[PDB]
Write a protein that binds this ligand. Sequence first.
Ligand SMILES: [Zn+2]
Ligand SMILES: [Zn+2]
Length: 84
Amino acid sequence: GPLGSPEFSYFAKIQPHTFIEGEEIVKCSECGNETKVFCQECTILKAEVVGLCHEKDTIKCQRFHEFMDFELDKNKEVIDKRKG
Ligand SMILES: [Zn+2]
Ligand SMILES: [Zn+2]
């Protein structure tokens, strides 16, 4: 049936990707809100700390996570580090 507003509450599902709450407070480009989320499944393969938003659960941003590969040069600032 159609996926809208069914009466099947008290239900949970498991996903392949693992989303965890990091520390560094990042601001989504679309949501533009204070959030600190990072996918462990991606952090490994990509080998880098990825930033996500809690809204990912139900938002267009969710797509960005899937099409992460599709990325280009946006910022033009020199990289940096801390305590490295
Ligand atoms: Zn977002
Ligand atoms: Zn992921």
